[PDB]
Design a protein around this ligand. Structure first.
Ligand SMILES: *[C@@H]1O[C@H](CO)[C@@H](O)[C@H](O)[C@H]1NC(C)=O
Ligand SMILES: *[C@@H]1O[C@H](CO)[C@@H](O)[C@H](O)[C@H]1NC(C)=O
Lengths: 49, 50, 48, 50
């Protein structure tokens, strides 16, 4: 634990990036979290929503 | 399953049931192709800042 | 879908379950579409 | 069948041409909810039930 101060910065940056990539898997109330699924499954009037 | 990428040979020992693979983002990173049952790795196409 | 996951393990313990880790691979993904609430296993007799 | 005993048929292991369903005028109501009607020929499905 001698170099904990640098390791905390590295861990916080990696954890923030990891959470940012994890946010892509959430649909946020939509039918799916994948854009390609929405483009392939719906007409533009519902796809825009 | 739709997407864009380069399909390459892989060394991932998939188990018989296993078909595709997923990264942290849950986007497909490897896939088993139908008809020929081979395992193709999917690597996103090169991009960066001009 | 009635999922059967299975694993075969070589064991040498006499009476109880062995203590260890063994992940069960999915064996059969079965398309039945029926209601199941009660089950019963089947044994085999030996006749002499 | 009647609506209290509605008949459920499984559809599996077939290639389905849904374009004869869209282009037929015999149906008074042809309304899809989770999928576009014109994309049904471009997608692959399982657990199809009528
Ligand atoms: C067709 O696909 C099945 C599995 O989906 C495979 O077993 C078979 O070899 C394929 N046939 C040809 C001619 O590719
Ligand atoms: C299955 O049967 C039980 C009664 O044995 C009933 O309470 C339950 O609602 C049924 N479920 C379905 C999905 O039919």
């Amino acid at each position: 634990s001698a170099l904990g101060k640098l390791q905390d910065v590295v861990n916080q940056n990696a954890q923030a990036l990891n959470t940012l990539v994890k946010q892509l898997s959430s649909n946020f109330g939509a039918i799916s979290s994948v854009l390609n699924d929405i483009l392939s499954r719906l007409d533009p009037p519902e796809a825009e929503v | 399953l739709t997407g864009t990428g380069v399909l390459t040979e892989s060394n991932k020992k998939f188990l018989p049931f296993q078909q595709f693979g997923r990264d942290i983002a849950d986007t497909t990173d490897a896939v088993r192709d139908p008809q020929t049952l081979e395992i193709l790795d999917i690597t996103p196409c090169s991009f960066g800042g001009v | 879908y009635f999922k059967i996951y299975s694993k075969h393990t070589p064991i040498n313990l006499v009476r109880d379950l062995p203590q260890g880790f063994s992940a069960l691979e999915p064996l059969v993904d079965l398309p039945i579409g029926i209601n199941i609430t009660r089950f019963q296993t089947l044994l085999a007799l030996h006749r002499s | 069948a009647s609506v209290y005993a509605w008949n459920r048929k499984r559809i599996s292991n077939c290639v389905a041409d849904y374009s004869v369903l869209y282009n037929s005028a015999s149906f008074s109501t042809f309304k899809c909810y989770g999928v576009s009607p014109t994309k049904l020929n471009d997608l692959c499905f399982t657990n199809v039930y009528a």
